Structures are given as C-alpha cells and as structure tokens.
Write a protein that binds this ligand. Structure first.
Ligand SMILES: [K+]
Ligand SMILES: [K+]
Ligand SMILES: [K+]
Ligand SMILES: [Mg+2]
Ligand SMILES: [Mg+2]
Ligand SMILES: [Mg+2]
Ligand SMILES: [Mg+2]
Ligand SMILES: [Mg+2]
Ligand SMILES: [Mg+2]
Ligand SMILES: [Mg+2]
Length: 65
RNA sequence: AAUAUGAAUUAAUGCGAAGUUGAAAUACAGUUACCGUAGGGGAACCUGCGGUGGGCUUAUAAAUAUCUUAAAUAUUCUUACA
C-alpha cells in the first residue's frame, strides 16, 4: 500500500527501500576472496577429481577420536 | 604254612512297602550353611575352635555456573562468485 508522496515512508516501504540498497550499493568497496562460507559446502561442492589433501584438511576430516 | 569248603558266632549295608517322634536342610528356611576336629544328645541334630562363600560387590549424589556489535550483517544461497 504505497504512502502519499507527502507522507514519510511506511515500514514496508523502508524494507523495500533497504532491499534496493542491498542489491546495488551494499556490496561496494571490496570483494572477498579466500574466505570460507559454510553454506557453500552444500550448494557448491567440488568435483572428486579436484579434491586435495589441503581441502580435506581445511574441512577437519583428519581429526579422529 | 598256604588254598578251598562248611561253620558256631558276629559286623556293615541296600531295597521295599509303611507309619511314628521331631522339623535339620532349600527364602535372611525363621539360630547363615558348609569343611576339619572335639564334646554332648531319642532321632534328625546341638555346642566349642579355626576355615570357606558354594550368603550380604545384594555395591548407586551433602543440589547450586559467566560480558560484546540480534542482524541494513547470522539465518536464505543450487556449480555461482571468484
Ligand atoms: K541349622
Ligand atoms: K563342622
Ligand atoms: K562343628
Ligand atoms: Mg528349630
Ligand atoms: Mg528348620
Ligand atoms: Mg537354620
Ligand atoms: Mg549341648
Ligand atoms: Mg562356627
Ligand atoms: Mg543360600
Ligand atoms: Mg552371590
């Protein structure tokens, strides 16, 4: 329900105004490299041929009981 | 002297039925049982001394618990970013 052009933004409009900022501006200034994101293990798993000892070790697979 | 036989005479024991006097054992069996040994008692048994567990491992709380960006940021994310 858009608000009148004279009235201030509603709570819903502020949320959509923030979502617009999040897509464009919020990620300006730098990119992030070589940082582990937990979700990417599930959604971007590597292929078996590209797995290294380093990758297995980074995941903690070597830590037994 | 040995072997065999019978033997006066005399000792131990099994089974069978079948009651009698008690109630010793199996449960904490109503006094823990049993082993060795000694004494005593109608009968099982009772008592002393040490031993054994084939009886007590059957074992189960005097309680007290802590601070960093709660999110425009983690929570979403589908091979993308890099
Ligand atoms: K007895
Ligand atoms: K005895
Ligand atoms: K005795
Ligand atoms: Mg008696
Ligand atoms: Mg008795
Ligand atoms: Mg008894
Ligand atoms: Mg006596
Ligand atoms: Mg005794
Ligand atoms: Mg017993
Ligand atoms: Mg026992």
């Amino acid at each position: 329900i858009p608000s009148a052009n004279d009235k201030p933004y509603s709570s819903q409009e502020l949320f959509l105004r923030q979502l617009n900022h999040s897509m464009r501006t919020a990620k300006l200034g730098a990119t992030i490299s070589k940082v582990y994101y937990p979700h990417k293990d599930i959604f971007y798993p590597p292929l078996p041929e590209n797995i290294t000892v380093e990758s297995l070790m980074s995941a903690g697979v070597h830590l037994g009981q």
